[PDB]
Amino acid sequence: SLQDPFLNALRRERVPVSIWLVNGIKLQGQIESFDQFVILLKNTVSQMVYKHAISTVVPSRPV
Amino acid sequence: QSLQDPFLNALRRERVPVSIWLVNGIKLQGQIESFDQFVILLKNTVSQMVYKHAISTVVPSRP
Amino acid sequence: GQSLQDPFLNALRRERVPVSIWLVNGIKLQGQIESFDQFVILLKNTVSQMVYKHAISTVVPSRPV
Amino acid sequence: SLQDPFLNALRRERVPVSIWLVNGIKLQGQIESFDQFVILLKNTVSQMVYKHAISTVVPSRPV
Amino acid sequence: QSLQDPFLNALRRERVPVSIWLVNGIKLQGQIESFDQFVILLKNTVSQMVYKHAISTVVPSRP
Amino acid sequence: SLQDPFLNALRRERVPVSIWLVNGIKLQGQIESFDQFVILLKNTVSQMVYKHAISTVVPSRPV
DSSP, X not given: OOXXXXXXXXXXXXXXEEXXXXXXXXXXXXXXXXXXXXXXXXXXXXXXXXXXXXXXXXXXXXX | OTTHHHHHHHHHHHTOEEEEEETTSOEEEEEEEEEOSSXXXXXXXXXXXXXXXXXXXXXXXXX | OOTTHHXXXXXXXXXXXXXXXXETTSOEEEEEEEEEXXXXXXXXSSSEEEEXXXXXXXXXXXXXX | OOHHHHHHHHHHTTOEEOOBBXXXXXXXXXXXXXXXXXXXXXXXXXXXXXXXXXXEEOBSSOX | OTTHHHXXXXXXXXTOOEEEEETTSOEEEEXXXXXXXXXXXXXXSSEEEEEGXXXXXXXESOO | OOHHHHXXXXXXXXXXXXXXXXXXXXXXXXXXXXXXXXXXXXXXXXXEEEGGGEEEEEESSOO
């Protein structure tokens, strides 16, 4: 798995990401947590995003 | 299972109202009655069955 | 895993409750649940049509069961 | 499996069906053949349809 | 297995031009070079990898 | 099976790719790495792309 170190680094370092969804909508926030199926995106509000609904995870700055 | 399950369980036991957004953009509302590997039973006017595969985000109305 | 789908659909079926089945594309199907398996739901209306679970967003009863 | 007898009888009896796609498009034709993942829709032209792209299979007449 | 494989193989061996419609409505064109459980390699000006999960229909330019 | 040699060939040769998403948005960059579920695409930043959201991976130069 490359997924787990990619997300885990962005979570340890508290990097602001943009999570684009498969319908077009972008979301922005810090990655509070994740597991095999979902990512907890902690923003103004902490929301759970299903990976199946995600197209790409983009760090706002080069880490 | 180690983020998704306790997130959805905390919501279910505390009976917190949630916004469940589908991938097609619609926003369902209500309280989580129960959930398994595939579906979430969401209760409001009736108990409706929502397939996880059709959900983008789950948004708790309080932390 | 199965625990919940089968009892939920069976309750509607046995009680012949009219359901709205919403598709992920926003189209809404209507009718009675005639049967189901792991992947499909047969929805009886003017005809018995086969609906793929993968294309279903929500199953919504018409009356509070 | 309920799927196999449903499709098999529409094929044996050569019933014209109106398959539906998860994007909106409807296809019409007879079911020439199928397996676990695809259905062969025989029309003016034969085309293989992936089930994952199908929402519903609707017979044009009550069989 | 038994419909999808020999269909995509007869297309590959006979080098028949096909139309691969995606679920988003785009029509890719070209010849099947190879395929496994998940992807189809479609050759035209280059060889592009098309994920089956994103395909609605495969339409051969001849029977 | 075919994915790996395809992506590895693009990666090793550092061939720029267009990755089309199922929503029709096109991403661009180099392939850094990939696992069973994701492709790390390096452009201005290293972004993680979910395979489930990809329709087609397209090279810019014929291999």
